[PDB]
Amino acid sequence: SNNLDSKVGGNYNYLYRLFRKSNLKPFERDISTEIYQAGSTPCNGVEGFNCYFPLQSYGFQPTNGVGYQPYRVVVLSFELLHAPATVCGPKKSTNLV
Amino acid sequence: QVQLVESGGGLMQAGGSLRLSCAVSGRTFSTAAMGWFRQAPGKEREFVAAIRWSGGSAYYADSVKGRFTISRDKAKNTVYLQMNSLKYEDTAVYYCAGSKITRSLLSDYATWPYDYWGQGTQVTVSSK
Numbered sequence: 001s002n003n004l005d006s007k008v009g010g011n012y013n014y015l016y017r018l019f020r021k022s023n024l025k026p027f028e029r030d031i032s033t034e035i036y037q038a039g040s041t042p043c044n045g046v047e048g049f050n051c052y053f054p055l056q057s058y059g060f061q062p063t064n065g066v067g068y069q070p071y072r073v074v075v076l077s078f079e080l081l082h083a084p085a086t087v088c089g090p091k092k093s094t095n096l097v
Numbered sequence: 098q099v100q101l102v103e104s105g106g107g108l109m110q111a112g113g114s115l116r117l118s119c120a121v122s123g124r125t126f127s128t129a130a131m132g133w134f135r136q137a138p139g140k141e142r143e144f145v146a147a148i149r150w151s152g153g154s155a156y157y158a159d160s161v162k163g164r165f166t167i168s169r170d171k172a173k174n175t176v177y178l179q180m181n182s183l184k185y186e187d188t189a190v191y192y193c194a195g196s197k198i199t200r201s202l203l204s205d206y207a208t209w210p211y212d213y214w215g216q217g218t219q220v221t222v223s224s225k
Contacts (some may be wrong), residue, residue, distance in 0.1 A: 033125070054203055057152065
């Protein structure tokens with residue numbers, strides 16, 4: 001998605017988290033904007049030494065490397081839950097014998 | 098929805114120390130950038146200091162380089178301007194502003210418009 005997400009000079013609209021207190025569980029979503037305390041002195045919302053903002057903006061330029069250029073990724077999660085099947089394929093059904 | 102509440106400054110001697118604040122409420126400026134301006138009588142509003150919010154890189158005008166310093170806090174949602182080594186010419190009405198556009202060059206934030214402006218706070222620098 002370099003063509004759409006890249007503009008002259010680079011796009012910074014998309015962020016990613018750099019630090020977190022612990023390992024994320026599968027399908028776990030944190031969106032808090034708290035200051036990250038990498039040190040011993042609590043930040044209490046105060047940045048500085050060992051108090052960084054966990055997010056960092058991507059640099060997506062048209063001249064960036066292919067490994068640095070933006071990519072759009074979709075993750076489809078499949079489940080067979082306690083219910084009749086709801087999402088089915090284009091298969092054509094037949095009469096019963 | 099978005100309010101930029103300024104504080105600090107005032108009248109003191111030359112070379113004094115001040116640190117202007119501009120509290121940001123209802124919005125974050127992560128991908129865009131924030132900037133400071135001042136407006137002296139009979140003059141146009143002039144650029145002083147602009148900073149990228151996420152990255153922390155600073156950009157200063159030649160009238161303020163080495164004398165004024167810009168800093169920000171993200172959780173408190175406040176930007177500061179450390180006003181050291183004052184001069185007589187620095188007397189003006191200072192305007193905090195935040196942009197809605199993500200500009201690739203932090204230098205483009207010195208001229209490109211800001212869609213949020215503060216109320217304005219006077220700063221006066223006096224003689225002996």
